[PDB]
């Protein structure tokens, strides 16, 4: 079964139909105004009206801003792209900072486009070039068509084909008892190998045999294929399927990202609009979640001023835990949240708040019953108390090690005497710093 | 045109043995399937 | 219903500058309101750009944050039309890993001068009635053939050359296809199968949408207009078969000798009447990002007869020029600031702040009461204009959730309590001073 | 006798992490002494590693120099053993000249998760005795030997071609996989090492195979999740496994691999083995790299991290800011901290005893006593370094057991930091730069 992580319980925002928050629902507890706010943002993303609008979740360490951002992705579900990033990802060795941001802005926009596939396949039982009764004038013989007899686990039938197929059927080393396929939209033929039926005809042969096709000789299906605009950017900027020196040299060489030009972005925008107009393809504008924003550089922020104002951009969600820090890439310029004031003017802030002693107790129970652990009430009333003296993360951190110690001492549930033993093994940030300060001459 | 395969796949020569032929013996010319059957063929011929 | 790739964004409502024929700004038109002084000046530099006579003219737009600096630049970019190159850059975007700063600016300049080439060629366009290809029984490979083409009015037969036959056979054209042949280029192109003959067919080699037969004269002329920047002409000429670098962006530090050679050849095409040169504009937003090395390049780069018109915008007081110790106006050194004309912008009043909100709700498809506009306008002066603009969608959504059909004042008071302004956020950050990081 | 490529070093005598079945630490076992409280904690996290139920866990080991932090991690790595990945790096190794600090950390994570797969095989492996062919399509036969049997195959057409391309001859030892068909020479039989007397630039002699000629079986392969990412980076990417030359794997590839591995564990085709990543000297990761760990420790598949550090309250690299351990607070509360304690005289004797048993040295009880004082007036690590030198002086003296005088000779020749830095002050103006 799947492993457990620091957000595995977050299943949604947990709202009424009226859009008011519930005290505890879909794995979340508390933060009601911030959850109500994210409710509005989910409707904004589902509306498909808007571009470039952005929100900053602001609040101290361990208050739920990452959890809430993840919850929005649950409300939207799998069909619309949600792209996570951290501020520290922009500093690549291959490519400039502003290109990393621009790629991510194009990852968070999807196409869904749908098309038929048709193919013929089977073991070839016969190749029967068919002559006309008389040749054309002056000629010795004339062939009107080839018959190919294909068989599969479901049956057998003849296909009748244009004489020009015959050249291809000797470029490929096709012989009777091979299995082949023909792409019905293109007319090309490809060999797969000798059928598995014949695997016994020598003690050794230097070919891998392939099993007989199952289902009909002629196959059809409709499939829906989904791609980001960033995938179209890259596939056009470095082509594939080389039969030329430029391609093959380019494919033996070490691949590296490159600064994709604004012309290519332009041309891709022009053609996907033609397909959207013709009803061939559906756009799904998505979300970019830039976490840990306070790690971006002032050059990056000053690029975002242009990026967020573009008519194309996705919805952007930002997060930060900083107070009045200096902006990276400047010497002295302090600002709220570690962000420039003139970017912070372009975002709606959502504010996130510390938990009360009752709320922590309620979350620790939700962790235990998802991490697969049983706890007695007299132990939980100790662990929520430790949480109040220390931090939510540390009081949640003790659950699994307490369970392990309980199991080694032969019990099926955490008890008081377990948690007050684990607390003696592992310090926290607050208590460790005290130990350093009493001993500062020895580090 | 496709000539048909023979009916049964070739089996081991050792009389009680159901396994298919893997190889043939270098000396006696019998069809074989394992080191076990090779020792038995070599002892009984 | 259907959603295209371009949507509602921050400046989608602007559609020009709203000047009259005597170049005076109307109070509210083409989605711009107020700001009469700077809109007049923008009219004059736009007129200068359209004339095209004089190279290297530079303009700087200045003023407080949130007073339509970028809006006026977008305004003129709309008015100037699509047919004339207008390039936007934020000042951050020249700090490449692939090429030096002076190269990046040289590319941004040369990308903003267009060469416009009209091209005409003669095409044959018809439905394929038959194809004959004859191949030697051994021989040298000198294949020969005949092809026949039809329209609703005419049909005829073509005896086929040996260079041309490889194209038909490469692209596997067959009877029933409708095709367009460019005689000069020797390139085939296909429209699709005609509706009629696909009934009389083998097991399938193709399965695609049909198209109608062409009409009237079998031979016709085609015309295309290409606009090609000087930059892409430099890239094409930097190496044999270099075309992918126009999309890939892989071409680093182009040889000066190539550009000198192109500058000459472009002038010859002008005098020959083969191509039209068309000066455009480079807009560098947030220009105070440039290093003094970049400024020093601009000083002398701006003096060439191939230079485009340059526009810059900034929101900076007396500040230290990036990459140095020295304070200066706009954070630009005086060497450069002496070489240009400054246009300046003014803070808004009630009267025009309300009018901006009114023209914004028309674009986002919202109705509000006059009472709601009155409250929102106050918010938009207690706090910045962008924040007030940002409440309009949030108000519409909260309205729609409760099954309303017009935004009321309590919707706005609701939203205003839910999403913070910076000033309120920064205030709450004082009372939790120990709980946030690195104060 | 012969000196192998691995030989006696620092953390060499620790052969596990000495614990009873109740995870009570013994006073002295598996080559460790003292440090009881940290050794219990180490036991509990080792049990957590072995279960592998929960992802993204982290522990930090802290405490003064020469108190066993890397000893406990190097002990724990052996208690855990092979068959479970354990990747160790120094903090300073992530500063690559060909990929970002993010990628160096990303690969160090993806390198500590293993996938186990079953594979169903048959292979033939033997010395070739004779190849015979005739022209009526071609027809042929081929004979294989192994020490237990000699046997013949009635090979088909494409095999006849392939054997000519690969130029097999009698006395060559070869393998084939029948399912795939591909031939592969291993060398020539020692029994044939004389049918030439000037051999080509590379030919290699091997013993003739034994047992069954066509062995058929399951095999189980364990492969690190990182290699699946690298093989999918480019058209012949596997070369980069050895070359190191792989440049910022595109994000959509790692996502695709995670999807596929998740599918295989639901199908039961594969299973995921969580391992460990150890970063020693973590105090010199940079502020951008710390902010990446804040989201690396949150995936559905991440290792456990163990990190060790020696620093007090000190400035975080890449900033002005002071903090505990030189680590940001937004990471220190995702961690869980184990603290060492300085050693007593009692422990200092025992650990020196274990080093003399490992380095194969005898000492007088007086000599252990004198050495223990030196190792308590000055660092433990200095006393550990005196014993080899004391032995080498003893051998030159034609002794056998190290005496007090052998300690005092070495103590006169080799200085510690505190004696050295004092002598540097008595002549300071003769040295360069302050
Ligand atoms: N409102 C909540 N309801 C449930 N669990 C929460 C809530 N807020 C936080 N948590 C949990 O507490 C921990 C801290 O939350 P996180 O999102 O990482 O905080 P932050 O991003 O503010 O530092 C995580 O394990 C998270 O899943
Ligand atoms: N005079 C105006 N007429 C119309 N819209 C305006 C005007 N001035 C500003 N705006 C709008 O108000 C917002 C802020 O203007 P903006 O161009 O971003 O300001 P600046 O670049 O000066 O900081 C934008 O949405 C813009 O479209
Ligand atoms: N408890 C211990 N048992 C055995 N050897 C130890 C113990 N603690 C430290 N050592 C040894 O002492 C030396 C220093 O320990 P080490 O862990 O490397 O120091 P640090 O804690 O500063 O990283 C090494 O030779 C190590 O093997
Ligand atoms: Zn047998």
Secondary structure string (H, E, C) spanning C148-201: EEECCCCEEEEEECHHHHHHHHHCCCCCCEEEEEECCCCEEEEEEECCCHHHCC
Tokens of D86: 């354990």
CATH of C9-113+229-348, one of 3.30.70.270, 3.30.160.270, 3.30.70.2190, 3.40.50.300: 3.40.50.300
Q: Is D274 in the A-facing interface, judged by CB distances under 8 Å? A: yes
A401, A386 in Cβ contact below 8 A?
A: no
> How far, in Å, CA of A6 to CA of D296, rounded?
11
In a domain, A360, yes or no: yes
Any ligand 2 atom below 6 A from CB of C69: yes
Residues belonging to chain B: 45
Report the CATH number that the domain containing residue A231 is assigned in CATH: 2.40.50.360
C287, C333 in Cβ contact below 8 A?
A: no
Give the pairing of strands A189-194 and A178-183. Answer: antiparallel
Q: Is A404 in the D-facing interface, judged by CB distances under 8 Å? A: yes
Q: Across-strand partners of C90?
A: C285
Structure resolution, Å: 3.4
Q: HSE-up of C282 (CA within 13 Å, CB side)? A: 29
> How far, in Å, CA of C74 to CA of C80, rounded?
10
Q: Is A94 in the C-facing interface, judged by CB distances under 8 Å? A: yes
End-to-end CA distance of chain D: 50
Environment class of residue A9 by beta-carbon count within 10 Å: exposed (0-12), middle (13-18) or buried (19+)?
A: middle
| 3-state class (DSSP) for residue C236 | helix
DSSP D279-303: EETGGGS-HHHHHHHHHHTTSSS--
Environment class of residue A177 by beta-carbon count within 10 Å: exposed (0-12), middle (13-18) or buried (19+)?
A: middle
Same domain, A330 and A373: no
A316, A83 in Cβ contact below 8 A?
A: no
Of the residues A206, A235, A300, A326, the best mutation for testing chain D's interface (the one with the most D CB atoms within 10 Å of its CB) is A206
D110, D258 in Cβ contact below 8 A?
A: no
Q: HSE-up of C325 (CA within 13 Å, CB side)? A: 0
What contacts A195, CB < 8 A, 6 or more positions away?
A: A123, A177, A178, A179, A209, A210, A211, A212
> How far, in Å, CA of D225 to CA of D61, rounded?
27
CB contacts of C244 in chain A (<8 Å) are 237, 239, 246
Q: HSE-up of A385 (CA within 13 Å, CB side)? A: 10
Any ligand 3 atom below 6 A from CB of D317: no
Architecture field, domain C349-439: Orthogonal Bundle (1.10)
Q: Which residues of A are annotated as a binding site for ATP?
A: 59-66
A344, A56 in Cβ contact below 8 A?
A: yes
> How far, in Å, CA of A434 to CA of A432, rounded?
5
A235-269: b (≥16 Cβ within 10 Å) or e: ebbbeeeeeeeeeeeebeeebebbbbbeebbeebe
Q: Which residues of D are annotated as a binding site?
A: 63-70
Ligand nearest to the CA of D63: 3
C35, C18 in Cβ contact below 8 A?
A: no
Q: Please say which residue of A217, A235, A253 terminates a domain.
A: A235
Give the pairing of strands D314-315 and D86-90. Answer: unpaired
**What is the CA B27 to chain-centroid distance, rounded?**
14
Same domain, A112 and A227: yes
What contacts A226, CB < 8 A, 6 or more positions away?
A: A110, A111, A112, A113
Helices D380-396 and D404-413 cross at an angle (nearest 10°) of 110
List Cα–Cα distances, D427 to A410, C160, D423, in angstroms: 67, 99, 7
Any ligand 1 atom below 6 A from CB of A392: yes
Interface of A with D in 296-325 (CB under 8 A): 321
In a domain, A388, yes or no: yes
Q: Chain B closest CA to D188's CA: distance in Å?
A: 21
Same domain, A364 and A392: yes
Element (H, E) at C48: helix C36-51
> How far, in Å, CA of C17 to CA of C29, rounded?
7
Tokens of D340: 């060492």
Question: After what residues is chain A interrupted, C–N > 2.5 A?
Answer: none
Q: In degrees rounded to 5, what are phi and psi of residue B32?
A: -140, 175
D132, D138 in Cβ contact below 8 A?
A: no
Environment class of residue C67 by beta-carbon count within 10 Å: exposed (0-12), middle (13-18) or buried (19+)?
A: buried
Q: Is A234 in the C-facing interface, judged by CB distances under 8 Å? A: no
> How far, in Å, CA of D406 to CA of D382, rounded?
15
List Cα–Cα distances, C403 to A18, A50, C117, D245, in angstroms: 10, 21, 56, 60
Torsional class of C330: left (φ above 0), alpha (ψ -120 to 50), beta (otherwise): left
Helices vs strands, H then E, count in chain A: 15, 14
For chain B, the maximum distance between any two Cα atoms, rounded to a whole number of angstroms, is 45
- From the CA of D308, give the closest atom in ligand 3: 23
- This structure was determined by cryo-EM
**DSSP, res A161:** E
Give the pairing of strands D149-153 and D139-146. Answer: antiparallel
Same domain, A268 and A387: no
> How far, in Å, CA of C117 to CA of A132, rounded?
55
Gap from CA of D258 to ligand 1 centroid (Å): 24
Tokens of C223: 């015309």
D32, D67 in Cβ contact below 8 A?
A: no
In a domain, A443, yes or no: no
Cβ of B5 within 8 Å of Cβ of A176? The answer is: no
Nearest alpha carbon, ligand 3 atom 10? D68
Q: Across-strand partners of A21?
A: A15
Q: HSE-up of A57 (CA within 13 Å, CB side)? A: 29
A177, A198 in Cβ contact below 8 A?
A: yes
Same domain, A208 and A286: no
In the numeric block, the tokens 């706090």 are attached to C383
Residue/partner pairs of A332-335 with CB below 8 Å, 24 or more apart: none
C322, C314 in Cβ contact below 8 A?
A: no
What contacts D241, CB < 8 A, 6 or more positions away?
A: D227, D230, D231
Residue ranges in C291-408 assigned as alpha helix (H)? 292-301, 334-337, 350-363, 370-382, 385-401
- From the CA of D35, give the closest atom in ligand 3: 1
Same domain, A302 and A388: no
Q: In degrees rounded to 5, what are phi and psi of residue D373?
A: -60, -50
**Vertex A220 angle, CA A214 and A221, to 5°:** 105
Q: Is B1 in the A-facing interface, judged by CB distances under 8 Å? A: yes
**DSSP, res A2:** P
Same domain, A364 and A378: yes
| 3-state class (DSSP) for residue C129 | strand
Closest CA to D206 of D172, D158, D233: D172
Cβ of A349 within 8 Å of Cβ of C398? The answer is: no
> How far, in Å, CA of A384 to CA of C246, rounded?
61
D141, D152 in Cβ contact below 8 A?
A: yes
Q: Across-strand partners of A181?
A: A121, A190
Q: Is B35 in the D-facing interface, judged by CB distances under 8 Å? A: yes
Same domain, A16 and A98: yes
Any ligand 2 atom below 6 A from CB of C61: no
What contacts A414, CB < 8 A, 6 or more positions away?
A: A368, A373, A374, A375, A376, A379, A399, A402, A403, A406
Q: Which of A125, A201, A203 sits opposite B23 (nearest CB)?
A: A203
Domain ranges across chain C = 9-113+229-348, 349-439
Tokens of D240: 């980069």
- From the CA of A30, give the closest atom in ligand 1: 1
DSSP D65-100: SSSSHHHHHHHHHHHH-SSS-EEEEEGGGG--SSS-
> How far, in Å, CA of A210 to CA of D179, rounded?
10
Helices C230-238 and C256-272 cross at an angle (nearest 10°) of 120
User: How many other β-carbons are positioned within 10 Å of the β-carbon of residue A42?
Assistant: 21
Any ligand 3 atom below 6 A from CB of D62: no
Any ligand 2 atom below 6 A from CB of C355: no
Interface of A with C in 41-60 (CB under 8 A): 43-44, 47-53, 55, 58, 60
DSSP D299-325: SSS--EEEEEE---SEEPTTSS-EEGG
Gap from CA of A393 to ligand 1 centroid (Å): 8
| 3-state class (DSSP) for residue D364 | coil
Cβ of A323 within 8 Å of Cβ of C436? The answer is: yes
> How far, in Å, CA of C112 to CA of C228, rounded?
10
Closest residue, chain A, to D237 (C-alpha): A254
Domains C9-113+229-348 and C349-439 share a fold: no
Gap from CA of D277 to ligand 2 centroid (Å): 51
Of the residues B1, B20, B23, B24, the best mutation for testing chain A's interface (the one with the most A CB atoms within 10 Å of its CB) is B1
In the numeric block, the tokens 């399965």 are attached to C207
Q: Secondary structure of chain A: what % helix, strand, coil (to 5)?
A: 40, 25, 35
| 3-state class (DSSP) for residue A160 | strand
- What torsion do the CA atoms of C16, C18, C23, C26 make, to the nearest 10 degrees? -160
Cβ of D153 within 8 Å of Cβ of B34? The answer is: no
**DSSP, res C84:** S
Q: In degrees rounded to 5, what are phi and psi of residue A188?
A: -75, 150
In the numeric block, the tokens 């039938």 are attached to A157
Sheet holding D172-176, edge to edge: B31-32, B23-25, D149-153, D139-146, D124-134, D172-176, D183-189, D205-206
What contacts C233, CB < 8 A, 6 or more positions away?
A: C115, C262, C266
> How far, in Å, CA of A138 to CA of A121, rounded?
38
Q: Is D90 in the B-facing interface, judged by CB distances under 8 Å? A: no
Closest CA to A255 of D235, D115, D200, C302: D235
Tokens of C51: 């004339």
Interface of A with B (CB under 8 A): 125-126, 176-177, 197-198, 200-201, 203
Cβ of C438 within 8 Å of Cβ of D321? The answer is: yes
A232, A268 in Cβ contact below 8 A?
A: yes
Cβ of A400 within 8 Å of Cβ of D54? The answer is: yes
Any ligand 1 atom below 6 A from CB of A13: no
Q: Do chains D and A touch by CB distance (3+ pairs < 8 Å)? A: yes
> How far, in Å, CA of A28 to CA of A13, rounded?
7
CB contacts of D149 in chain B (<8 Å) are 35, 38
Element (H, E) at A78: none
Architecture field, domain D9-113+224-343: 3-Layer(aba) Sandwich (3.40)
Q: Please say which residue of A204, A235, A266 terminates a domain.
A: A235
A70, A193 in Cβ contact below 8 A?
A: no
D105, D296 in Cβ contact below 8 A?
A: yes
Cβ of B2 within 8 Å of Cβ of A197? The answer is: no
Q: In degrees rounded to 5, what are phi and psi of residue C226?
A: -105, 135
Residues belonging to chain A: 443
Q: In degrees rounded to 5, what are phi and psi of residue A96?
A: -70, 150
Q: Please say which residue of A321, A354, A387 terminates a domain.
A: A354
Give the pairing of strands C341-344 and C58-62. Answer: parallel
What contacts C64, CB < 8 A, 6 or more positions away?
A: C315, C345, C347
Nearest alpha carbon, ligand 2 atom 3? C32
**What is the CA D293 to chain-centroid distance, rounded?**
22
Same domain, A307 and A364: no
> How far, in Å, CA of A307 to CA of A329, rounded?
19
What contacts C88, CB < 8 A, 6 or more positions away?
A: A306, C77, C283, C285
Helices A416-425 and D36-51 cross at an angle (nearest 10°) of 110
**What is the CA A217 to chain-centroid distance, rounded?**
36
User: How many other β-carbons are positioned within 10 Å of the β-carbon of residue C244?
Assistant: 18
Task: Tally the domains of chain A.
Answer: 3
D62, D69 in Cβ contact below 8 A?
A: yes
C252-272: b (≥16 Cβ within 10 Å) or e: eebeeebbeebbeebeeeeee
Tokens of C97: 């890993």
Report the CATH number that the domain containing residue A416 is assigned in CATH: 1.10.8.60
Mutate to test the pocket of ligand 2, among C66, C91, C344, C376 (most ligand atoms within 8 A of CB): C66
D274, D261 in Cβ contact below 8 A?
A: no
Tokens of A199: 């695997």
> How far, in Å, CA of C263 to CA of C254, rounded?
14
Same domain, A294 and A337: yes
Closest CA to D311 of D295, D293, D328: D328
In the numeric block, the tokens 């923008």 are attached to C42
C319, C327 in Cβ contact below 8 A?
A: yes
Q: Do chains A and B touch by CB distance (3+ pairs < 8 Å)? A: yes
Helices vs strands, H then E, count in chain B: 1, 2
> How far, in Å, CA of A281 to CA of A166, rounded?
38
User: How many other β-carbons are positioned within 10 Å of the β-carbon of residue D385?
Assistant: 16
Same domain, A84 and A223: no
What contacts C384, CB < 8 A, 6 or more positions away?
A: A345, C65, C66, C421, C422
User: How many other β-carbons are positioned within 10 Å of the β-carbon of residue A96?
Assistant: 22
Same domain, A10 and A77: yes
Q: Which residues of C are annotated as a binding site for ATP?
A: 63-70
For chain C, the maximum distance between any two Cα atoms, rounded to a whole number of angstroms, is 95
Element (H, E) at D208: none
Helices vs strands, H then E, count in chain C: 14, 16
Q: Chain C closest CA to A362's CA: distance in Å?
A: 22
Task: Mention the CATH class of domain D344-434.
Answer: mainly alpha
Q: In degrees rounded to 5, what are phi and psi of residue C89?
A: -140, 140
Residues belonging to chain C: 439
Domain span holding position A399: 355-438
One-letter-per-residue 3-state SS of A228-288: EHHHHHHHHHCCCCCCCHHHHHHHHCCCCCCCCCHHHHHHHHHHHHHHHHCCCEEEEECEE
Element (H, E) at A373: none
In the numeric block, the tokens 């439905």 are attached to C127
Of the residues D123, D151, D210, D215, the best mutation for testing chain B's interface (the one with the most B CB atoms within 10 Å of its CB) is D151
C51, C22 in Cβ contact below 8 A?
A: no
């Amino acid at each position: 079964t799947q492993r457990i992580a620091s957000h595995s319980h977050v299943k949604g925002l947990g709202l009424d139909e009226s859009g008011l928050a519930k005290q505890a629902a879909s794995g979340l507890v508390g933060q009601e105004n911030a959850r109500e706010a994210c409710g509005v943002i989910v409707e904004l993303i589902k509306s498909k009206k808007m571009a470039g609008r952005a929100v900053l979740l602001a609040g101290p360490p361990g208050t739920g801003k990452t959890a809430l951002a993840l919850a929005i992705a649950q409300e939207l579900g799998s069909k619309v792209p949600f792209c996570p990033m951290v501020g520290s990802e922009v500093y690549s060795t291959e490519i400039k900072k502003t290109e990393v941001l621009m790629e991510n802005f194009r990852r968070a926009i999807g196409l869904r486009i749908k098309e038929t596939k048709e193919v013929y396949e089977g073991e070839v039982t016969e190749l029967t070039p068919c002559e006309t009764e008389n040749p054309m004038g002056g000629y010795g013989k004339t062939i009107s068509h080839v018959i190919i007899g294909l068989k599969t686990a479901k049956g057998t039938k003849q296909l009748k084909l244009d004489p020009s197929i015959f050249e291809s059927l000797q470029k490929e080393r096709v012989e009777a008892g091979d299995v082949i396929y023909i792409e019905a939209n293109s007319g090309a033929v490809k060999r797969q190998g000798r059928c598995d039926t014949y695997a016994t005809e020598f003690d050794l042969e230097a070919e891998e045999y392939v099993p007989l096709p199952k289902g009909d000789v002629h196959k059809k299906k409709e499939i829906i294929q989904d791609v980001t605009l960033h995938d179209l950017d890259v596939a056009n900027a470095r082509p594939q399927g080389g039969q030329d020196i430029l391609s093959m040299m380019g494919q033996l060489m070490k691949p590296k990202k490159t600064e994709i030009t604004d012309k290519l972005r332009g041309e891709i925008n022009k053609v996907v609009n033609k397909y959207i107009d013709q009803g061939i393809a559906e756009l799904v504008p998505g979300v970019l979640f830039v976490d840990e924003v306070h790690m971006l550089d002032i050059e990056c922020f000053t690029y975002l001023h242009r990026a967020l104002e573009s008519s194309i951009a996705p919805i952007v969600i930002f997060a930060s835990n900083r107070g009045n820090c200096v902006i990276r890439g400047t010497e002295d310029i302090t600002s709220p949240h570690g962000i420039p004031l003139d970017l912070l003017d372009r975002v709606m802030i959502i504010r996130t708040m510390l938990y009360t002693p009752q709320e922590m107790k309620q979350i620790i129970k939700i962790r235990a019953q998802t991490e697969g652990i049983n706890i007695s009430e007299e132990a939980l009333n100790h662990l929520g108390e430790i949480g109040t003296k220390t931090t939510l993360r540390y009081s949640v951190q003790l659950l699994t090690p307490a369970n392990l110690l309980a199991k080694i001492n032969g019990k099926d549930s955490i008890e008081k005497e377990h948690v007050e033993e684990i607390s003696e093994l592992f310090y926290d940030a607050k208590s460790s710093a005290k130990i350093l300060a009493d001993q500062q001459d020895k580090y | 045109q496709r000539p048909s395969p023979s009916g049964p796949p070739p089996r081991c020569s050792v009389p009680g043995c159901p396994h298919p032929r893997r190889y043939a013996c270098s000396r006696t010319g019998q069809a074989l399937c394992s080191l076990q059957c090779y020792r038995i063929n070599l002892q009984m011929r | 219903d259907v959603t295209r790739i371009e949507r509602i964004g921050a400046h989608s409502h602007i559609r020009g500058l709203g000047l009259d024929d005597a170049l005076e700004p109307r109070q509210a038109s083409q989605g711009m309101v107020g700001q009469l002084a700077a809109r007049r000046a923008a009219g004059v530099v736009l007129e200068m750009i359209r004339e095209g006579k004089i190279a290297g003219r530079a303009v700087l737009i200045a003023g407080q944050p949130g007073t339509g600096k970028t809006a006026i630049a977008m305004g003129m970019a709309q008015a100037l039309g699509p047919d004339t190159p207008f390039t936007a850059i934020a000042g951050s975007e020249i700090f490449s890993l692939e090429m030096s700063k002076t190269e990046a600016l040289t590319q941004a300049f040369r990308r903003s001068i267009g060469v416009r080439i009209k091209e005409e060629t003669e095409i044959i366009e018809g439905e394929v009635v038959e194809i004959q290809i004859d191949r030697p029984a051994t021989g040298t490979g000198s294949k020969v053939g005949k092809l026949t083409l039809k329209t609703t009015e005419m049909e005829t037969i073509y005896d086929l050359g040996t260079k041309m036959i490889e194209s038909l056979t490469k692209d596997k054209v067959q009877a029933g296809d409708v095709i367009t042949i460019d005689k000069a280029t020797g390139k085939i192109s296909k429209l699709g199968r005609s509706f009629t003959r696909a009934r009389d067919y083998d097991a399938m080699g193709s399965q695609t949408k049909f198209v109608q037969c062409p009409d009237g004269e079998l031979q016709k002329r085609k015309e295309v207009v290409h606009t090609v920047s000087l930059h892409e002409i430099d890239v094409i000429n930097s190496r044999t078969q270099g075309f992918l670098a126009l999309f890939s962006g892989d071409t680093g530090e182009i040889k000066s000798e190539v550009r000198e050679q192109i500058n000459a050849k472009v002038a010859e095409w002008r005098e020959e009447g083969k191509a039209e040169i068309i000066p455009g504009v480079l807009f560098i937003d947030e220009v105070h990002m440039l290093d003094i090395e970049s400024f020093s390049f601009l000083n002398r780069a701006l003096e060439s007869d191939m230079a485009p018109v340059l526009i810059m915008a900034t929101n900076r007081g007396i500040t230290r020029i990036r990459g140095t110790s020295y304070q200066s106006p706009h954070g630009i050194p005086i060497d450069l600031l002496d070489r240009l004309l400054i246009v300046s912008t003014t803070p808004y009043s009630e009267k025009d702040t309300k009018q901006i909100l009114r023209i914004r709700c028309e674009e986002e498809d919202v109705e509000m009461s006059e009472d709601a506009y009155t409250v929102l306008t106050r918010i938009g002066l207690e706090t910045s204009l962008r924040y007030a603009i940002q409440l309009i969608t949030a108000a519409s959504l909260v309205c729609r959730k409760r099954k309303g059909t017009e935004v009321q004042v309590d919707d706005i008071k609701r939203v205003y309590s839910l999403f913070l302004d910076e000033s309120r956020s920064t205030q709450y950050m004082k009372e939790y001073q120990d709980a946030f990081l690195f104060n």
